C-alpha cells in the first residue's frame, strides 16, 4: 500500500511571542487538500496575504528564514516548518495574526506536541519525495553546505565556536533509527549575551528570554536548569536545517551535510539544487514495505 500524503486531522490553535518582534501572535494550523504544500497566511491584513513556504519566497533577512510577498513578510518559520517535516505533513494552512511565528520554548517541541495532540489524516494521493541523484555543494568563506545521494534521510552538522561552553560541536542523525521527536525536536535556539545586547540596542530580539532561548555569557549557560541534550547547540542547527530543507515543498530522500552553515547558505543550497535538475527527481512509493524511509502511525 502506497506512502500517502498527510494533512492535519483537526485545527491547532496556539499563542506566543515573536522572538524578534516581541509581538503576541495567534497561530492556527488547518487541514489543507492534496498537493497544497505548507502555505502561511497573514490573517491580520485585509485582504489576507498567503505565502507558500517555498525557496522562491525566501527574503534576504539576516536573522531567520523569512517568507516575503511584496512588502509583506513572515519571520522565523524554520522551527514550525521543521516540526511539519519531522511529522511528514505535506498539506496545511498556517494562519498568523502577526509578522513573526511565535518562538514557544525555542524548539519545535510545543509545535510537534500540538500537531500530534490533533493527530494527522492520510489523504488519497501518493506523497512526493525529492531524491538527490548527484552531489550538490556550496561554500562561502569557511561555511559549506552539501546534498549527497543517500537511500533514506540523514542530516550531519558541525559548528566551531571558540567559546569555553564548547562539549560536542558535531552530530549525525539517520531518521530511520533516530526519532526526530525524542532526539532533535526539543533542541532550543541559543544566543550569546554580547550578541543579544547588540540586537536589543538595534530594537531586535524583543521577545527573547531564558523561557525561549539557551542564554550563554562568556563562560556558561545562564539558564538556571541548563541543557536538555549534551549536544543541544549542534542538535538545534540540525533542527533549523530540517526546517530549511522543507522549503523544497516535499520530503527529502538524501543526506544533508552542514559545516558552520546557516539559513543564508542553506537557502543558496536549495536554489542551486532546484536549478540543477540533473541532481534530483520527484519519486513516489506504491509499496511502503520497500521504501527507504517509514512514518509513524497517523
Ligand atoms: C537578559 O534577559 C533578557 C530578558 O528579556 C533577554 C533578552 C533577549 C534574549 C534573547 C535572544 C536571542 C536573540 C537572537 C538569537 C539568535 O538569532 N541566535 C542565533 C544562533 C542560534 C542558531 N540559529 C537559530 O536558532 C535560527 C535563528 C533563530 F534563532 C531561529 N533559528 C545559530 N546561531 C548562531 O549562529 C549564533 C552565533 C550567532 C537567539 C536568542 C534573551 C533574554
Ligand atoms: Zn533555530
Swiss-Prot record:
Q: Which reaction does it catalyse?
A: a UDP-3-O-[(3R)-3-hydroxyacyl]-N-acetyl-alpha-D-glucosamine + H2O = a UDP-3-O-[(3R)-3-hydroxyacyl]-alpha-D-glucosamine + acetate
Matches recorded under Pfam families: LpxC
Q: What's the cofactor?
A: Zn(2+)
Keyword Metal-binding carried by entry: yes
**Which gene specifies this protein's sequence?**
lpxC
Q: List the disulfide bonds.
A: none
Which PANTHER family would you find in this protein's record? UDP-3-O-ACYL-N-ACETYLGLUCOSAMINE DEACETYLASE 1, MITOCHONDRIAL-RELATED
Documented EC number(s)? 3.5.1.108
Residue positions annotated to bind Zn(2+) are 79, 236, 240
State the active site. Answer: 263 (proton donor)
Q: Which GO terms describe its molecular function?
A: metal ion binding; UDP-3-O-acyl-N-acetylglucosamine deacetylase activity
- The kind of enzyme this is, by top-level EC class, is hydrolase
Q: In which pathway does it act?
A: Glycolipid biosynthesis; lipid IV(A) biosynthesis; lipid IV(A) from (3R)-3-hydroxytetradecanoyl-[acyl-carrier-protein] and UDP-N-acetyl-alpha-D-glucosamine: step 2/6
Q: What does this protein do?
A: Catalyzes the hydrolysis of UDP-3-O-myristoyl-N-acetylglucosamine to form UDP-3-O-myristoylglucosamine and acetate, the committed step in lipid A biosynthesis.
Under which name does UniProt file this protein? Answer: UDP-3-O-acyl-N-acetylglucosamine deacetylase
Q: Which InterPro entries match?
A: Ribosomal_Su5_D2-typ_SF (IPR020568), UDP-acyl_GlcNac_deAcase (IPR004463), UDP-acyl_GlcNac_deAcase_C (IPR011334), UDP-acyl_N-AcGlcN_deAcase_N (IPR015870)
Which keywords does the record carry? Hydrolase, Lipid A biosynthesis, Lipid biosynthesis, Lipid metabolism, Metal-binding, Zinc
Cellular component (GO) terms are: membrane
What organism is recorded for this protein?
Answer: Pseudomonas aeruginosa (strain ATCC 15692 / DSM 22644 / CIP 104116 / JCM 14847 / LMG 12228 / 1C / PRS 101 / PAO1)
The Swiss-Prot or TrEMBL record describes its family as follows: Belongs to the LpxC family.
In its UniProt record, which GO terms are filed under biological process? lipid A biosynthetic process
